[PDB]
Write a protein that binds this ligand. Structure first.
Ligand SMILES: *SC[C@@H](O)[C@H](O)CS(=O)(=O)[O-]
Ligand SMILES: [Mn+2]
Length: 524
């Protein structure tokens, strides 16, 4: 089977291929990462935790300015290209420049020992993409073994590489200026050929988010939702999905001993149900505490891969040290976490969709039940905060299609399963402080158990949001945010301000005529 592999690599441009370490075991990868003689960023370091640690150099996070998608007959009219109307990272690359870069990476990966790992992006039998990653660095192969779904031996016998990632991190492009690119580095995608090239950056995330961006292209075009969310399932099979930017409490509210975790970051929703795209977790570790983060900490053992953490002379890890970067990370296969769905990360249809937001303006209700149109409007807005952040579809950096396409397919799936969407503000109110964890958990409990659907509803002005008048165990005095203000004028002025920010933010999305129709569902 290696012969067929070498041939396929040869067809991509790689020549003089030496030994290929094909789908190595975790034990083999561990030894490869720590063998004597490794130089540069290839080198893994042994830690007191039994987990290997590596560094990534210059790039310790994604490089959106270096992201490109090839402009061709397939993508011309389908990709949500960057434009003056709405700036984004989908920058067009000519076929000529792509050819030059593919040849450059193929040359970088020629004449040497290679690691090749095959895995699936998507737990769905019908919508998964078979990913093959080729690298000259063992730990990069380990990252892919962790983050994508690990095929069974039977599945590998019939494995089809729908997308190939050629990782040429050691390679940089000195022709960039003349080619009109951003820098000597590049993270490029050719949708027609099914290839992602990585040059110059060693950040692990480029591999994970590259395929996420590709799932975000292929799935919605086939009517399958592609989402940046977490998802869990209850004892009775009830599925809920949670959306929310950093600081909204997504991780905590998605954690429940009574519910199994489907996934924490990337999911699809097809005719059968909700499925994780990934086979592992890529978690932030800065200031990580065993007491504060027991689950993540316990997963950091052999087979986890630490990235950019400070490792002392004795092998101990100083998780509080952000000297290399504040974005320290660790990746690990999902089974390093206990309360998860097994042996495949998927379940049935979602019936509860929760949009979390931390409103620093103290205007939005702790919980609102949205209409279908509002669900699309607030999904496109992706608001959280007072300094506001608006990230379309809670994942602007990975949107290969227009935000409205993700919103439309999400609502179509919701309509088919009778799902309801709720906007939950885990942020502030008239008290000047954030809502209590007791009240937010009570709110999430009422959404999951359906009691919110039995509540009498009122309506908040300006945003025209349906709000419950009472929920089991939740303080009724906070449900209408106006009630937490002694002077309802403070609310009024801040609401008009926040409303204005939503309306101004939305203009750029109106460049798409379908999204333009949603203005009426937004605040007035
Ligand atoms: S960036 C790729 C480039 O460094 C290339 O591998 C150099 S060569 O092997 O001398 O052609
Ligand atoms: Mn993410």
């Amino acid at each position: 089977d290696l012969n067929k592999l070498v041939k396929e690599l040869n067809d991509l441009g790689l020549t003089d291929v030496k030994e290929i370490v094909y789908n190595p075991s975790y034990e083999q990868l561990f030894e490869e990462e720590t063998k004597p003689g490794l130089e540069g960023f290839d080198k893994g370091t042994l830690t007191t935790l039994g987990a290997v640690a590596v560094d990534t150099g210059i790039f310790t996070g994604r490089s959106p300015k270096d992201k490109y998608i090839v402009c061709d007959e397939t993508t011309k009219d389908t990709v949500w290209w960057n434009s003056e109307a709405a700036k984004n990272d989908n920058k067009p690359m000519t076929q000529e420049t792509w050819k030059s870069l593919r040849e450059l990476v193929a040359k970088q990966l020629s004449g040497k020992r290679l690691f090749v790992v095959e895995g699936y992006c998507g737990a769905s039998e019908k919508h998964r993409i078979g990913v093959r990653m080729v690298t000259e660095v063992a730990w990069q192969a380990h990252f892919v073994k962790n983050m994508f779904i690990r095929p069974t031996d039977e599945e590998l016998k019939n494995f089809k590489a729908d997308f190939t990632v050629l990782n040429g991190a050691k390679c940089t492009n000195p022709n960039w200026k003349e080619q009109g690119l951003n820098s000597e580095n590049f993270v490029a995608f050719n949708i027609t050929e099914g290839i992602q090239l990585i040059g110059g950056t060693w950040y692990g995330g480029e591999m994970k988010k590259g395929m996420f961006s590709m799932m975000n292209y292929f799935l919605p075009l086939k009517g399958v939702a592609s989402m940046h969310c977490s998802a869990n399932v209850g004892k009775d099979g009830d599925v809920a999905i949670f959306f929310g930017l950093s600081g909204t409490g997504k991780t905590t509210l998605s954690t429940d001993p009574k519910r199994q975790l489907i996934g924490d970051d990337e999911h699809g929703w097809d005719e059968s149900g909700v499925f994780n795209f990934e086979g592992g977790c890529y978690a932030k570790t800065i200031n990580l505490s065993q007491e504060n983060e027991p689950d993540i900490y316990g997963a950091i053992r052999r087979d986890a891969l630490l990235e950019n953490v400070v490792v002392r002379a004795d092998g101990s890890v100083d998780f509080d040290d952000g000297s290399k970067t504040e974005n320290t990370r660790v990746s690990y296969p999902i089974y390093h976490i206990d309360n998860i769905v097994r042996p495949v990360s998927k379940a049935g249809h979602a019936t509860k969709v929760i949009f979390l937001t931390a409103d620093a303006f103290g205007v939005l209700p702790p919980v609102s039940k949205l209409t279908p149109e509002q669900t699309e409007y607030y999904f496109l807005s992706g608001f959280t905060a007072p300094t506001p952040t608006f990230s379309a579809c809670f994942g602007a950096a990975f949107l290969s299609l227009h935000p409205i396409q993700y919103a439309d397919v999400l609502v179509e799936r919701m309509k088919a399963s009778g799902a309801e969407a709720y906007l939950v503000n885990t942020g502030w109110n008239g008290t000047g402080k954030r809502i209590s964890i007791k009240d937010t958990r009570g709110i999430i409990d009422a959404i999951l158990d359906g009691s919110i659907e039995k509540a009498e509803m009122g309506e908040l002005p300006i945003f025209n949001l349906a709000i419950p008048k009472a929920l089991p165990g939740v303080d009724p005095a906070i449900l209408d945010p106006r009630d937490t203000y002694a002077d309802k004028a403070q609310w009024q002025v801040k609401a008009e301000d926040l409303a204005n920010r939503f309306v101004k933010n939305f203009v750029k999305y109106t460049a798409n005529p379908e999204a333009a129709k949603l203005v009426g569902a937004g605040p007035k």
